[PDB]
Amino acid sequence: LSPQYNWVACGILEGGLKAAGVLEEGQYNRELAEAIAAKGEGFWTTQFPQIGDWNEDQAAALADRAQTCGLVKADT
Ligand SMILES: C[As](C)(=O)[O-]
Numbered sequence: 091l092s093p094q095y096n097w098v099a100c101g102i103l104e105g106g107l108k109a110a111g112v113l114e115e116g117q118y119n120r121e122l123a124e125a126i127a128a129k130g131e132g133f134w135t136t137q138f139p140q141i142g143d144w145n146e147d148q149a150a151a152l153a154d155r156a157q158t159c160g161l162v163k164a165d166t
Pocket residue numbers: 115
């Protein structure tokens with residue numbers, strides 16, 4: 091795994107997610123995704139469905155990085 095997947099980078103991720111206040115104990119991938127997407131919900135995402143799409147796709151990407159870092163549990 092390239093330098094972007096070690097426990098250091100993963101630490102930065104966890105730090106980031108705790109700073110955003112989206113990460114919580116016993117959390118699942120999908121839960122975290124909804125949380126990340128809820129934080130960027132507002133004017134741009136409602137008035138523009140595509141930005142809404144982008145938002146959720148990023149949230150999805152981050153929750154996945156989080157899952158690989160073992161920050162959140164796999165879906166059931
Ligand atoms: C060990 As902890 C406070 O990041 O769940």
